[model samples]
Target: LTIDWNSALYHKIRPQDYKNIIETDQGLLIAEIFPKISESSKTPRSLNFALNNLKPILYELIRAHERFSYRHIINNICPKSDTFYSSPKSVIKLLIVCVRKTFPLDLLGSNSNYSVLSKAIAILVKKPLHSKILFDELCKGLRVKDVKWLETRRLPAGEQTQKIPYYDVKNRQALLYKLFFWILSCYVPKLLSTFFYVTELSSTVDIVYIRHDTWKTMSQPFLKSYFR
Candidate 1:
């Protein structure tokens, strides 16, 4: 039997019934779309269609099964058979959508789910090239206008009362920040090594020497930003 994948009637339907329908359909959807995405056959429109339809189903699955489901979906998206580096760009894009959609942002506010999602992101971006791609994707996904609106004191009368019930803008911005830090944390060793190499090279070059005091003062502000 076919399902109305694009219907907006989930709320009216019983949760158990909806979940059961999703469970039945999700496997077929994943099996169909993922191969096309990995093999670079799916067009952007179809990829987006698959992404939009899968998000709510994945959210429900993760809600019902918790971390197990979260990790399961992630593994399916970035399977060992098709690694991120080897996968086409479309597959990587779908992986990012899956990551962002399955993330437990509400649970994160209570600090219960940070480590799982953070670790997943860490694993995805382990390679420098992978890290760069994911970083760029995350950056592109960020909504600067929402953050600016949140920061602004002056707002239109209707704007103050209007809010998204399911996913708050603040939680999304927070998630983006945490994702960036997690990705950066993976590069800490590399960043430090590069910094040390640059300092040592400058020291050896007699014409351009950086003094200890100057380095200390220069690095203080940089360290201060990260420390927060």
Candidate 2:
């Protein structure tokens, strides 16, 4: 998928997490496109559109008020309390009312905003996409569903390494299920299931937890587990 670099704050990589699935063998692709947004970048129209993306997913209890709501939930649970917030409308309003009654959106810059954005999404999303699986959909959308021309045959899976953290492997399944079902599978760009792999590198999504069990991997404990 094409992501606008403008949305990205300065990219600082740890090099250790360089092995994430977003990094692929195909070529250099932007894996972590975290954004640093504030009043300057805050377009009411765009933010509203972004918020609209979440409305369908919002039922009675599970709702988000756009990026701001996402950040609110994440900060409430994670170590990154001050580090992230979404939309900044409420955040900016609070600062104006309490701290010197001033607004300082530019003070935080893009990367800081992006840090919050990344951490919020990190908490909100966990591991939502398998690069290989996501890549297939992108290819199919281009009308090149034929596996050969799709370049599906490239750096395939191999022996596991201790470096591949257990959490990363297993938590990814939940991320995949939630993102696929909510964002694309049931909503937009719905695609037919291509294949299923009974074989897995690690455990199923049920075994994993996010934010140190701050939230269960799935809404229901028993049902979301490895399955029937």
Candidate 3:
């Protein structure tokens, strides 16, 4: 289950044989090393991953390993499960998944724009009893620029939260987006709980599949924004 970090799967080989193990990506160099030759020795190399990719270079290579391993295991488990009929399809499935969804990767980072994320959270507050002050604070933590985005509210029909309302911006769209995401985050745990029940039911019966459109009732604009 564990790979010895410093084994010479390639160490004993001549320098020419050692050439392949020291790989280069663009201008980056990855050199594998064998620390100890024995089990009692501090490090051992058992598997081939760390044998060829080390330290800072290893970080990116580990990601590469995970990516390739996922594809390898999935393909072996269900051969021909995914189609790569086109060049783009082949490249994407080999490098990433094709779930018919696309998202900007930068939006997932710590430096993500608060303006967008707050809009996500505002739409979130409507689902449960959410304190506006708390939601406003959360926006601050995410580094939102326009603090006014979370200042006003057009509460949903079912929302019982107090409305201290005075609309400022030209639209409530930004706040709606924020509440929408905040609610969605809380729903993640709810979903994991539901999934366990759903899985149990699935094991016993074939539940009819409802298409994504049924979720329109959940929150129409949320799905619209996601799809948009």
Candidate 4:
């Protein structure tokens, strides 16, 4: 059945409402909206039908740019062993669809490195194949320094594309460190790589050419030198 995207029922569900929806037997919002069903059906037909129909609309929301609707539906559908839980592949597909929704073709331009980077790490660290497929697709469009961390961390496993190399860095310290560092770190190299001509020109070197105007400060020069 076709759901009305503009309807009050579609618009009213919220993430916070999930607790009440699951906790109580009746679909409170569901009952309020589909009163005909609420009055006659053995179940709260609003919740009952939402349990049936929300998935297609979830995918639709990804395309319709209806994430406020989508995430609320996800909150409903995410229970581990209940009416809404589905297969892993389906969950993965939903995630990819949302990723596509949130990002444009130029993903890194549309999303901050912090956004994609943290998500990519969370997906990668779990090391699920379905997660990796979507993660790799997303990673392809990431900025340079984000790509650098991605490269250092991910090498190919037999089926796992770009599996992480360092077990040492898996500790919480490194994860948080990388997260904080990503704010500036992801941008710095892109600016330098596009502007400077640094290559394997260094075991060590003193003479350097940095245009202060282009760089805008001594910090860029010193940071570029430090990186080199």
Candidate 5:
């Protein structure tokens, strides 16, 4: 069931209402949506069910003005158990899907919801494999190849078939850079690799080059050139 963000249910939801949804039945609702899988399963039932079941609550958590509920919801999503290590990909994907649907790319960074989303990602990325998969998924979602192809805002010949609107592509690229910085802050050891990954992908992309000043003002020391 798709969440109608415009519906009164979402607009009227309060912190207490979210607490009720999660706390009722000893959090059985959350478990049903994000089951603690013991083994890798192709097309896990919980993941499938979450697409419909978990989204409303996820939407409430992100769009809710207050930050108090983030810890509780994030803990339930990424519990400190064997499931944390065993099934990080499923957990990350669930959160990513909610995030993708909740906000447009331009509004992703510099928001309370982005912080909540990053907190959940930080937890999952504690595992090595989790970090790898998460970064891969982020890059894929950002469409790095497409960004690269649009060098200097000029589309490469014969690659016109794969294209996102230039404006949309810039927003996605900015979000990717934001994620890289968030990941770097959370996992300092990834600092070098993350820096290299973003720089390499954006090397030929002039939108990033031109927009560097905006990002710099958004966050101090964009790209940390002095450190490099």
Candidate 6:
């Protein structure tokens, strides 16, 4: 799947992500020659297209928005008030409005603005908090049958598929769901502000409560226990 790199403001990767996923080696050559008989657009690429290519854009958008939002909050740029307006937009919404007023057409081509904006919010908050709150919210909103499916190749039996929708290359509406799932599974737990793991404290904890992120190194908790 060819993504508009301009849309992925968060991803900080390279041109390698951009490529032709043709069915055969000669397909590219044929496309170069004929230019009209290309099937690349219809065949689609691997499911990781959103991750490998889109994640960089995700990274950039998230990183930049986090800085912007944080500055606004810390500097009190967002007015503190018990205010109400007859509008669908909120303070954060207004802030985003200022930034995305123009609304890049390339991203708008696929109507990804909603996904992009919501994802910026998901990335803005700190982990565990974000994981618990934002992640669950996404699940509540985006999880559905036609949008998400189940795939278990090497997954453990106990590891139930997320309450979120799975990626579908053929479906455009599932774009944001796919992108969010990729970030949640691939990046979140590893982030410095989030971690998930179990500990023996004469008690038990749900997988959701596992200290999955915020660990500086692997040698801290589990390692210390193992060494003793």
RMSD of each: 22.6, 23.0, 25.2, 24.7, 21.5, 17.2
The estimated TM-scores of all candidates read 0.24, 0.17, 0.18, 0.22, 0.24, 0.27
Badly placed stretches (over 4 Å) of model 3 are 1-133, 143-173, 176-186, 195-228
- List clashing residue pairs in candidate 2: 67-86, 68-86, 128-175
Arranged by TM-score with the best first, the candidates are 6, 1, 5, 4, 3, 2
Model 3 worst lDDT window (10 residues): 191-200
Where model 6 places Cα greater than 4 Å from the true spot, the runs are: 1-45, 73-77, 81-89, 98-112, 115-172, 180-228
Among residues 3 or more apart in sequence or in different chains, the pairs in candidate 4 whose N, CA or C atoms overlap within 3 Å are none
* Cα lDDT tens digits for candidate 2, 1-228: 432111121133222131221223211221111122112355444333432332222221111111123223324433323322222333323222221111122212133432332333232222223321232232122111111211212243684232434543343333322332232222111100100001112545411222322222223576567755
Error of 1 at 93 (Å): 4.6
Q: Write the per-residue lDDT of candidate 6 for residues 1-228, one digit (tens) a residue.
A: 322211222233221121111112333333332243234455444433422333333334444434443323312432333331111123335434433532232322333444554554444322222123334344344432322212212456897674434344334445444544444432222221121222222323211222222222434677668754
lDDT of each: 0.36, 0.25, 0.29, 0.33, 0.36, 0.33
Q: What does the lDDT read for residue 1 in candidate 2? A: 42
Stretches of candidate 5 off by over 4 Å are: 1-65, 78-105, 108-138, 143-180, 183-228
How does residue 81 of candidate 1 score in lDDT? 38
TM value for model 5: 0.24
TM-score of 6: 0.27
**Candidate 4 structure quality by residue, lDDT tens digits, 46-147:** 334433443333234234443335434344433333322233343434444444544333223234554655464334322321111331343433443332
The prediction achieving the highest TM-score against the true structure is 6
